[PDB]
Amino acid sequence: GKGKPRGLNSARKLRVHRRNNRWAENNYKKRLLGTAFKSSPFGGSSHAKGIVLEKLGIESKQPNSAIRKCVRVQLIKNGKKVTAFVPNDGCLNFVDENDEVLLAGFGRKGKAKGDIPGVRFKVVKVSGVSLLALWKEKKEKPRS
Amino acid sequence: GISRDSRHKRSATGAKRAQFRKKRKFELGRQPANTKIGAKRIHSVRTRGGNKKYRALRIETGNFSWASEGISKKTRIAGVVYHPSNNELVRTNTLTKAAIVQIDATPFRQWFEAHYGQTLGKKSKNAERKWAARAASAKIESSVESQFSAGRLYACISSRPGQSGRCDGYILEGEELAFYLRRLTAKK
């Protein structure tokens, strides 16, 4: 009988049956409780800009072997402190602390590209000016 | 704004209804007329479509009609002696629809003594037949007769003195006078 009712009055069961088994699916429970709204410091966004707090202290969740020139940042739409990242790395010279970024994930909402805790967000545009025409030696690549 | 909307109620499962739109003008309810005896100021009111309604607060005089005969006389009341809905209303002497009143006899008996030739209470050769050819026709009921000696009858009201301006009584008789005299001795 394959563990299920079939008879053509039993739909009362079935749409109450799957109703209690959608919660075993992962993104269903993630979605319909507003957990992306009660958490996830973007708050369901796609980008966020915020001041750089400071230079970052490396705590090994493996592996990229250097002090990765990363930036402690704290946003301004929320104010929730996240460790960040710059690609084309190096050039630690060209913006102070308490200065602007534009953040965006790594590809999995980040979670792993180097040995740094919670580093999941590529910086896109510091202070409104870009990085890709600023690693292109038109402008210059920032510091923390 | 006394609304007569249904959505302020509690639905029959017991559920409280959530709040919908603001109150409306097309679903309005006004004050009671609460119409009484002694003078007349009939405040007309203005309704939807122009369509004026009168409202007979202080009604005094009305076209009351005794049904078993077929004649309708302007008359004036003593007061009320019974009210079906609320027994407050006899104290205030409240006229409404379907109250029970005691009305004047003198139009009815001034018609009776000149039309019947019975002349109860107390013109040439053709016109005695008006008083003589009513064989078995000049007989009112004995319980109808006793109200004439007091000079005040028993009548009920079929008008809307809140919504028409009028008071049109009908003189109670027979079966229904027996019922409201059963109740009337029990309440008055």
Partner: protein
């Protein structure tokens, strides 16, 4: 209960504007207005030959029949001059190509001409709004008990 000579209320129940003639007393002795209900309904012979009044009776009172007519079975006659029917039906769901048992309770006024029991089969018609819940009025009683008057006296 009501004790025909039906005027147990504070106000004389009568047919409105129907006038039992008190001066002439003759071989009439019954002034009872009644109407057809429409739609091919046999009127109940209580209503022709009864003393009850019932303003909202579709045979003697100021209501009418329109639009809808609905079957069902009685339940809970513990109110006065009204019953409640409950209609069962099968809701449909196309996710599973299947059905679902549901029911609805209709509070419907009943006449004093008919006399019913919880478990009979009713046919009602729509009327003007009577109370909050009631929009219907009992008009045919298809009681299908099965003739148990002397059925226990069996061979």
């Amino acid at each position: 209960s009501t004790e025909l000579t039906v005027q147990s209320e504070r106000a004389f129940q009568k047919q409105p504007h129907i006038f039992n003639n008190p001066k002439v007393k003759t071989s009439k002795r019954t002034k009872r207005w009644y109407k057809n209900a429409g739609l091919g309904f046999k009127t109940p012979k209580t209503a022709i030959e009864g003393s009850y009044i019932d303003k909202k009776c579709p045979f003697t009172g100021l209501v009418s029949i329109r639009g809808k007519i609905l079957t069902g079975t009685v339940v809970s006659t513990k109110m006065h001059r009204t019953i409640v029917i409950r209609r069962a039906y099968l809701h449909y769901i196309p996710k599973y190509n299947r059905y679902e048992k549901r029911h609805k309770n209709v509070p419907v006024h009943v006449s004093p001409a008919f006399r019913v029991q919880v478990g009979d089969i009713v046919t009602v018609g729509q009327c003007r709004p009577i109370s909050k819940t009631v929009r219907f009025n009992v008009v045919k009683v298809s009681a299908a008990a099965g003739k148990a008057n002397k059925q226990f006296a069996k061979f």
